[PDB]
Symmetry: C2
Subunit: 374 residues, 2 copies
C-alpha cells in the first residue's frame, strides 16, 4: 500500500539534531478516562520534531519494513501540487490541521485507490465526509491528542493580553525601561468575568485552569453541562452567545462550533461587548471579521485580541492582525507542540497498525466507517 | 506636615487622558480574609495611572486641603537629587518598590523631621530598618496589595517560556509563519514538575494557580505549610533548595526569597536539562552571566522575570537579548489594579498617622 503524508516545512536552520529536553512528562489518560494512544511500538523518541517533512511522524521504517511506500511532501495546494499528483494511487492519506491536504469531492474522485483518510491531530473539516461515505473511505483522527495543548495556549494568551505582557517584553528587548508605558494598559485578571462559547474538551480544560485565578466563569453551548460540573466550578449558564458577551471581560472562542456562521463576530456584534473587552480565538480565523477586529483594537472598543487562527491561512505578510495594537497573535501552532506531536504521531501509527492488520480502529477515533458516520 | 513622595515618570507620550476600561473588577478581601484597603475616602477613580508623578497616588487634594505640603518627584538618586535635597525637612517619605527612594542610614541621619516611611506597595528593602528603629521612624507598607498580581505574572511567564510564546509571536509580527521554528522549542506544561522557593502569599497563590494544569508541585521554605494546605495542592516538601532543583522542570523564585547569587554556575549543574527559571524575587538571586551562559549552552530552556541587577537595567544588560528570555521591566506589582489598591492603602495609612489613630497591624513593619 502507498501512504501519502503531507507535513509542514522543516525549521529555517534545518531539521534539529538536538532538543531542549530529553523526554516528555509521563501522562497516562486524558481528563475523562480515555487513554493515550496505544501503538504496539514507535520508531521515534518522544520529543522529536515529527510534524515536519523530515520528521515523517516516525512512520517510514514501520511502513517500508512491511512492504509499503511512504511519500512525504509539503506541497498540498492546487491541481499541480505533489499531493494531487501522488493522490491518484494513494491508499492512505495523512495530514495535520496545521498544514492540511484538502480532500475535496473533486480530489476524492481522482483518488482511485483511497481507503483511509487519517487526520494527524484534531478536526476533519478538510475532508468532504459525503464523498468518503459514498466511496466507503474510513475517516479517523487522533481524538483528544492536543485539546489540553490548546487550552494552555488560551489561558496563556488571556494573561498576556490583560497584563500587557508582549509590549512590556519589547521594552526590555529594545533597551528601555518605561514602567508607566508598560503598565498604563496592564491589569490583573483576578475577579474578571470570563466566558467560553463551547464547553468541550478545550472549553472545559480552559474553565478548570481559569478557576483558581478567582475569575467569574461563564459559558454557552449547544447543550448544558451537568449541574454537578456547573456547581464544582461555579459557572454561569447562557442560552445564547449574545447573552454572554456583554457581561464578560474576556471571551474565548474554541471548537466545537455549534453554529459555524462566518463573521459571527463583526462590527455589529462587537457592539455587544464591553468597552475594553478581550477576545482569544483559537477556533477558526473567519469566525471574526478581519477588519471589524482591527477597527475595534484601533478604537479601544477591544483592549486586546489574541489567537492562532487567521483568514486567509497562512496569513499574507501584511495581514493587519500581525501589527494591530494590543494583539497577541501566533501562527497556527497551538496544537502542535512537541508534546502534542508525540501523541498524534503515536495515535497515527496505532490507527495504521489497526487498519493494515484488519483490527477494529478505536471507536473514539472514527468519524466515518464502512459507508456511514461513526 | 511635609510629605515627600517619589514616583516614576509619566509615559513617553504624556499622562493618559483615557484608559482601556471604565472600572476595575470588584474585590472585597484577599486570600485569608484580610480586607482591601479601607481609607475614609479616595479622591481618584480606580484604574487611573496613580504610580507616576502626574498621578500623585491621588493624594494632593487630600493633603493640601488639610494644611500639608506634598512634593512629588521622580529624581531619587545621588546626593544632588530632588529627593535628597527635599528630605531634610520631610515629615513623611513615600515611594514604591518599582521606583524606590532608598533610605540609607546617611539619608535617615539627614532627615531631622522624618516620622513615617511609607511603602506604596510591599517591601522595605530600600529602607535601612535599624536606622528607622533607632530613630522612632514608623515603617509601613500596604500588605497584600499586589501579591496576587505578582503571582499572575509568574504563571503567565511560566506558560510563555514552556510554550515558546514570545518567539512565536515575533514570527507573526514580522510577517513569517514558520510553524516548525515556533514549535521545535515548544512543549506542554501539563504533568511537568514545578517547585517554588517560598510558600508565602505570592508562592502560595502561584501554587494554587498551577494545580489545575496537572503539574506536580514541589516547594521548600523556612517553615512547612499546614498539612491541610500541603494536601489541597498535592505538595511535595523539600528541606533545602538544592534537594528541590534536580526534580524540577520549572523553578520559581518568589519573596520572601544564603540569598545572594544562590543561582550560579555551580548551582546550575543541579538542574535538569531544559529547566525553566522565573525570578520575580530579586535580580541578584541569580548570577547575571551564569544564567546567560546556561541559556546559550542549552542547559536552561528559558529564563523570565521582572527583576534585574542593576536596576534599572543598563541598555546592554545581557538579560535583554539572551536566548529564550521572557524578561519585562520591574512592573509585575504595579498594574493599574494593584495601583488602585496601594494608593488607597497609602491614604488609609496617612489618615491614621496624622489623625493619631492606630495603623492596621498587618501594615506595620516598624512602630
Amino acid at each position: 500500500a502507498k501512504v501519502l503524508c503531507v507535513l509542514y516545512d522543516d525549521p529555517v536552520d534545518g531539521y534539529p539534531k538536538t532538543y531542549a529536553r530529553d523526554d516528555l512528562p509521563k501522562i497516562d489518560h486524558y481528563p475523562g478516562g480515555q487513554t493515550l494512544p496505544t501503538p504496539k511500538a514507535i520508531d521515534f523518541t518522544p520529543g522529536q520534531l515529527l510534524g515536519s517533512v523530515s520528521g515523517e511522524l516516525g512512520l517510514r521504517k514501520y511502513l517500508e519494513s512491511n512492504g509499503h511506500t511512504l511519500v512525504v511532501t509539503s506541497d498540498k495546494d492546487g491541481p499541480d501540487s505533489v499531493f494531487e499528483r501522488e493522490l491518484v494511487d494513494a491508499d492512505v492519506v495523512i495530514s495535520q490541521p496545521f498544514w492540511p491536504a484538502y480532500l475535496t469531492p473533486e480530489r476524492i474522485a481522482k483518488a482511485k485507490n483511497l481507503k483511509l483518510a487519517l487526520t494527524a491531530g484534531i478536526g476533519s473539516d478538510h475532508v468532504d465526509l459525503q464523498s468518503a461515505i459514498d466511496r466507503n473511505v474510513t475517516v479517523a483522527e487522533v481524538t483528544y491528542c492536543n485539546s489540553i495543548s490548546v487550552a494552555e495556549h488560551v489561558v496563556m494568551m488571556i494573561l498576556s493580553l490583560v497584563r500587557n505582557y508582549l509590549p512590556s517584553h519589547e521594552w526590555a528587548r529594545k533597551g528601555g525601561w518605561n514602567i508607566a508605558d508598560c503598565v498604563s494598559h496592564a491589569y490583573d485578571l483576578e475577579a474578571m468575568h470570563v466566558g467560553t462559547i463551547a464547553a468541550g474538551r478545550i472549553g472545559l480544560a480552559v474553565l478548570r485552569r481559569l478557576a483558581p485565578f478567582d475569575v467569574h466563569l461563564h459559558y454557552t453551548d449547544r447543550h448544558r453541562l451537568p449541574e454537578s460540573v456547573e456547581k464544582e466550578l461555579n459557572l454561569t449558564w447562557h442560552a445564547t452567545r449574545e447573552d454572554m458577551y456583554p457581561v464578560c471581560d474576556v471571551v474565548t472562542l474554541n471548537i466545537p462550533l455549534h453554529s459555524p456562521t462566518e463573521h459571527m463576530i463583526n462590527d455589529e456584534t462587537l457592539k455587544l461587548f464591553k468597552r475594553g473587552a478581550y477576545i482569544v480565538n483559537t477556533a477558526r480565523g473567519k469566525l471574526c471579521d478581519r477588519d471589524a477586529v482591527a477597527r475595534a483594537l484601533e478604537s479601544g472598543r477591544l483592549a486586546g485580541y489574541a489567537g492562532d487562527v487567521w483568514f486567509p491561512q497562512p496569513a499574507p505578510k501584511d495581514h493587519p492582525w500581525r501589527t494591530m495594537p494590543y494583539n497577541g497573535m501566533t501562527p497556527h501552532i497551538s496544537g502542535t507542540t512537541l508534546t502534542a506531536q508525540a501523541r498524534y504521531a503515536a495515535g497515527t501509527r496505532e490507527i495504521l497498525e489497526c487498519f493494515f492488520e484488519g483490527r477494529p480502529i478505536r471507536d473514539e477515533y472514527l468519524i466515518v466507517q464502512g459507508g456511514a458516520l461513526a
